[PDB]
From a paper:
Colibactin, a DNA cross-linking agent produced by gut bacteria, is implicated in colorectal cancer. Its biosynthesis uses a prodrug resistance mechanism: a non-toxic precursor assembled in the cytoplasm is activated after export to the periplasm. Although the transmembrane domain is required for colibactin activation, its role in catalysis is unclear.
Crystal-packing interactions suggest that ClbP forms a dimer, and we confirmed this same dimeric species in solution using single-particle cryogenic electron microscopy (cryo-EM). To directly probe the oligomeric state of detergent-solubilized ClbP, we determined its structure by single-particle cryo-EM. The two-dimensional (2D) class averages derived from this analysis are consistent with the head-to-head dimer observed in the crystal lattice, and none suggests the presence of a monomeric species. After 2D and 3D classification, we selected 109,906 particles and generated a density map with a nominal resolution of 3.73 Å. The resulting dimeric ClbP structure is nearly identical to the crystallographic dimer (RMSD of 0.830 Å over 904 residues), except for a ~5° bend of each TMD toward the dimer axis. We also identified a branched density in the active site of both subunits that likely corresponds to co-purified phospholipids. Overall, our cryo-EM structure confirms that ClbP forms a stable dimer in solution through interactions matching those observed in the crystal lattice. In the dimer, the two periplasmic domains form a canopy over the cell membrane under which the active sites face each other. We discovered that ClbP forms a dimer that may promote the simultaneous activation of the two colibactin warheads, further supporting the proposed pseudodimeric structure of precolibactin.
Residue numbers in the entry:
A (entry chain B), B (entry chain A): 39 to 162, 165 to 416, 433 to 495
The structure:
């Protein structure tokens, strides 16, 4: 290890307050490992190379590579209309049915809206039923939008074109040919040996969090792997002498950036079949994924054969910039200050605001007691009856299809205290107002 | 003109609601012009090629080129300590004096905090006095932060090293050798023939806005130019065959991206001496600038000898990316949907909220009048006395050195109505509460 790099790792881990962090750094054959923390705080399970982490959205790299393999063998083509493989699919743009090529989903130019993540994330029907009659945000091929639901359609395409369940396709095409020992696409809700227990921030400290793994979302997330397996993954991507010819050509095509999309002035990030492609001081080929209880980012710089990977036990934006920070250290020897984590900021904001609301409630209760001393129902509870519905419908008004389920799952666990905090404050305040009117 | 491109221009103009828009598009020698709108709504002054616009932050390209010319002649070096040219300068990091090279200011690695724009934007002494004992946000050379005030220090460096006022240095070095007919760096507040009157959004429509041009801020903004002048400017950055050798080599060095700064995962935008450098489908070399009452963004793609130059009569984020939309059209023939302009969004939000506050005030006044009809001072005005100070100090609490002057200058003119709206609402509400207590 480089002591400075290990200090970087520990600093980022402590600032993100994640229970465990696993980082591997490859430099043109030379490798370094950074395996730290506890895979489970509830039993102080020491974190180790053998523990399994959820890859999050990096799963899309595996799905993209599988689709590129299928394309190389000629079983599937980029220009194929999706109806050829998902006849049940119907998608609307301005109320008009829209034909989408497999390439449109492959490069996130399908126009599916981000709120679709909430509906496919539902454990619950194939992808067609969960996307039946969905209304697109934009025309196919006219824009780039990282709607995470896109690669589930690619999962259905893989399943139908190949005639097997996604897990078997993964095992046959990627895990076994690459010699990977533990990487697996779960068959939905499943138990795996020595999996690190997922954690999510709540009230300033990690909270053990687990939710069912939607069967239909695995082709875009929830692929499980170990750090040694991801080292083999990085090695397979960086250098390819031993690989089969079909696999090598599929990887070569996998990095072809989708140039035919409008690009904003300050972003110009190209997206290949799974990988962000950035030409600035690169090619800096990378992705990044935060699951509700896991986060992971991988970065490849093949021109210098540098490969980074950060698998973490908890969702936090800091371990999505962690691979960029490590690459910056390797390139320069300097790294930026830790970015303000959105999850941490939101959790601290809710701590402050719910504590303030409870203090407000205590103050109003004290004033009510004082007025009762100075003096010595359904009508009041109606106000909570309205506030409950108002808050229940509010997220759906702000965004279409945004269920409170999504907010509870993705946001910090303290988010729930805001609805109940507001409802309790309204309860006590309205009741005391009615009492004062009676008094 | 390409009719589709002209439609793009008109669409962006109408959505941004700018009084006037001037765009020139050069394609490997072939050129197109788009001169539209009125340079002044107060007199319907038809916008024309001869009208002068403020270049905003694309001025930094001129100052950067001047510094690079001085560097080529050997009068100045990148590694020179700033104290050599500004002995009056003192800057602190964690309370410790910090030595800054001229390169630090040239590539925005100085650590000055963006709020120094408010102090230098103040008409108000040299740059040293206005930056005397300033506290840096980060160590020199350790980070990239687009503190717009950086190039004013470079203006002082130019003046001291060259021994002339900045305007004369510009005229001698850039305007005259390049044959530019009207581009001039103003000597502070100055009157120029056929300048387009500045405009800023207010209550949903443009408002004629003019503020003094701080003399000390000219080396980083407020340089004036015409569209033919910017066409010559583009033809000088490209097609360098006819230029002097020293000027050619200065331009060659001017695009040298500062690689020694940490780069975020999703940005990786390199900054040369005035120009953002992007390798994605490029080199895409471009700056972009919004003044309080002007906006303009230039974009070059030398490998294909393309370059847009959009100058505008009004500040709006859309025309700060209309030289990226045009590149997208040229490259692909497709362009993205108009981004939500921050100025437009803020102005509409303040329209809604101040109208709601006035409606609230009317309702409370109506209830007070009813209670007066239901009935047949300094004590109440004290509440406004507190609210006034609370709102006055509030921006300074949120950010260091953020004067209400800055908010009024940069924000839409409706922003002032929020202080007064809140103060009037508190006035009427507290007065009616006191009256009810008396009643």
């Amino acid at each position: 290890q480089d002591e400075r790099l290990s200090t970087l790792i520990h600093q980022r881990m402590q600032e993100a307050k994640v229970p465990a962090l696993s980082v591997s750094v490859t430099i043109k054959g030379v490798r370094q490992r950074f395996v730290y923390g506890v895979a489970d705080v509830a039993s102080q399970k020491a974190n180790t190379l053998d523990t399994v982490y959820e890859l999050g959205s990096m799963s899309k790299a595996f799905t993209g590579l599988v689709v590129q393999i299928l394309i190389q063998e000629g079983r599937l083509r980029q220009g194929d209309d999706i109806i050829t493989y998902l006849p049940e699919m119907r998608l609307n743009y301005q109320g008009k049915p829209a034909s989408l090529t497999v390439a449109d989903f492959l490069y996130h130019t399908s126009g599916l809206p981000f709120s679709t993540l909430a509906r496919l994330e539902n454990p619950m029907s194939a992808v067609a039923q969960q996307l039946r009659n969905e209304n697109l945000l934009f025309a196919p091929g006219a824009k780039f939008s990282y709607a995470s639901a896109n690669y589930d359609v690619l999962g259905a395409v893989i399943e139908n074109v190949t005639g097997k369940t996604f897990t078997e396709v993964i095992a046959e095409r990627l895990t076994q040919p690459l010699g990977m020992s533990a990487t697996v696409a779960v068959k939905g809700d499943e138990i795996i040996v020595n999996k690190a227990s997922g954690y999510k921030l709540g009230f300033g400290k990690p909270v053990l969090f687990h939710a069912p793994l939607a069967r239909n979302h695995v082709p875009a997330a929830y692929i499980h792997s170990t750090l040694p397996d991801m080292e083999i993954w990085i090695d397979a991507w960086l250098h390819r002498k031993a690989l089969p010819a079909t696999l090598r050509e599929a990887m070569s095509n996998s990095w072809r950036g989708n140039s035919d999309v409008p690009l904003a002035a300050d972003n110009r990030i190209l997206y290949a079949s799974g990988w962000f492609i950035d030409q600035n001081q690169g090619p800096y080929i990378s992705h990044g994924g935060q699951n509700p209880n896991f986060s992971s980012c991988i970065a490849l710089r093949p021109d210098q054969q540098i490969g980074i990977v950060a698998l973490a036990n908890m969702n936090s934006n800091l371990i999505l910039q962690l691979c960029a920070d490590i690459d910056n250290y390797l390139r320069i020897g300097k790294y930026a200050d830790g970015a303000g984590d959105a999850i941490t900021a939101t959790d601290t904001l809710f701590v402050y605001l719910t504590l303030l609301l409870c203090f407000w409630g205590a103050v109003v209760v004290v004033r009510g007691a004082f007025r009762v001393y100075r003096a010595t129902y359904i009508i009041a509870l109606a106000v909570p009856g309205l506030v409950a519905a108002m808050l229940y419908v509010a997220p759906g008004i702000l965004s279409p299809g945004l269920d409170w389920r999504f907010i509870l799952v993705w946001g910090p666990s303290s988010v729930l205290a805001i609805p109940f905090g507001i409802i309790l404050l309204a309860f006590v305040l309205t009741l005391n107002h009615q009492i004062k009117r009676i008094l």
